[PDB]
Amino acid sequence: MTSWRDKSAKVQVKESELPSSIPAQTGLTFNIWYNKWSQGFAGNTRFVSPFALQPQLHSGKTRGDNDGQLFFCLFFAKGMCCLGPKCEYLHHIPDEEDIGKLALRTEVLDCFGREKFADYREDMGGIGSFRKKNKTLYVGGIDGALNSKHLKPAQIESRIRFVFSRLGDIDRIRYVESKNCGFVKFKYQANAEFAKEAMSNQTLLLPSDKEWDDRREGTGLLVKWANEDPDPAAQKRLQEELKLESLNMMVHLINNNTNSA
RNA sequence: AAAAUAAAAAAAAAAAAAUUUGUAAGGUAUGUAUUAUUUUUU
Numbered sequence: 001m002t003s004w005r006d007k008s009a010k011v012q013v014k015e016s017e018l019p020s021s022i023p024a025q026t027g028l029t030f031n032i033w034y035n036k037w038s039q040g041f042a043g044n045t046r047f048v049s050p051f052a053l054q055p056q057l058h059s060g061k062t063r064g065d066n067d068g069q070l071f072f073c074l075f076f077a078k079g080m081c082c083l084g085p086k087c088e089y090l091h092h093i094p095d096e097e098d099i100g101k102l103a104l105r106t107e108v109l110d111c112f113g114r115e116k117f118a119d120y121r122e123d124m125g126g127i128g129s130f131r132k133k134n135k136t137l138y139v140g141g142i143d144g145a146l147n148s149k150h151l152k153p154a155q156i157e158s159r160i161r162f163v164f165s166r167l168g169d170i171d172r173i174r175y176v177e178s179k180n181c182g183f184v185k186f187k188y189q190a191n192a193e194f195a196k197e198a199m200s201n202q203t204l205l206l207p208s209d210k211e212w213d214d215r216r217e218g219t220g221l222l223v224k225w226a227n228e229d230p231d232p233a234a235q236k237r238l239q240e241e242l243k244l245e246s247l248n249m250m251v252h253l254i255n256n257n258t259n260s261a
Numbered sequence: 262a263a264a265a266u267a268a269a270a271a272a273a274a275a276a277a278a279a280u281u282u283g284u285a286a287g288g289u290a291u292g293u294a295u296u297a298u299u300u301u302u303u
C-alpha cells in the first residue's frame with residue numbers, strides 16, 4: 001500500500017549481475033545434458049545466497065497486477081528477479097485479499113504455481129503435499145547460518161523472529177537449544193510457502209554483527225517442512241481446531257442442501 | 262535363249278583370359294557401503 005500499491009517494483013539484480021548457469025567446479029568434465037560436473041567427488045556443493053528479499057524496498061506494482069495474475073514471482077522471493085515492473089508475477093508479500101483469490105487453485109498448487117506431490121520427500125524438501133496442509137516451517141542449519149560464532153539461545157530466538165516476521169502472520173515461534181531447531185508456524189499455507197523459498201540458503205547475521213564481510217562463505221539456514229508435533233498439549237490442540245473448523249462447514253453443508261431443497 | 266562368280270600354285274606365317282585388403286563381442290568380475298552434530302517440538 002504505502003510500500004506496494006503506490007510504487008512500481010524495482011529490479012533487484014541486473015541481467016549482467018545474474019549468476020552463471022554453470023555450477024562451480026565439482027568434478028573433472030562438465031556434462032552438457034544434465035548440466036552437472038562429472039568424474040570425481042562432489043564437495044558439499046551447497047552455498048549461501050549473495051542476494052536476499054527486501055520486503056519494503058522491493059515491493060511494487062508489476063505487470064501481473066494489471067493482467068490479473070494469481071501467482072507470485074519466485075525470483076522475487078529469492079531476491080533475484082531481473083525484470084522488475086515487466087515481470088508477469090506479483091512482487092509483494094501474499095495478503096488476505098490475494099489469498100482469497102488463491103482458494104480453488106491452492107489445494108493442488110502452491111503460491112508460486114507449482115504442483116504439489118502425494119508423498120512428501122525423504123528429507124521434507126521443496127514443494128508441499130496435496131494430502132496435508134502444513135503451515136509450519138522447520139528451520140535448520142542455524143550453526144551454518146550464524147557462521148559458527150556463538151550466541152545465547154534466547155538471542156537466537158529473536159534473530160529468527162525478526163527476519164521471519166515480515167513474511168506474514170507468524171502464529172508461533174519456539175527455538176529449541178537441545179535440538180538447534182526452529183518451528184515457525186504461520187496463519188496461512190501461502191505465507192509458509194512464500195517464506196520457505198525466501199529464507200532458504202540465507203544468512204542470519206546482521207550488517208553490524210562483525211562478520212558481515214565474511215558471511216558468503218557459509219551454507220545458509222536450511223528451511224524444510226515440519227513434522228507432526230509430538231508433545232500431547234498441541235495434539236489435543238490439533239484435535240480442538242479440527243473439531244471447530246468441522247462445525248463451521250457443518251453449517252455450510254446444510255445451507256447448500258437448503259439451497260437444494 | 263541362258264549366263265551376270267563356278268577359279269589355285271598345291272600348303273605357309275601369326276596368341277588372348279587376373280586375385281581383393283576391416284570392425285565389435287566371447288577376459289581380466291560382480292555386489293555392498295561411503296561428506297550429513299546439514300540436530301524435527303514431548
Ligand SMILES: [Mg+2]
Pocket residue numbers: none
Ligand atoms: Mg556362447
Ligand SMILES: [Zn+2]
Pocket residue numbers: 073074075076081082083084087088089091
Ligand atoms: Zn519477477
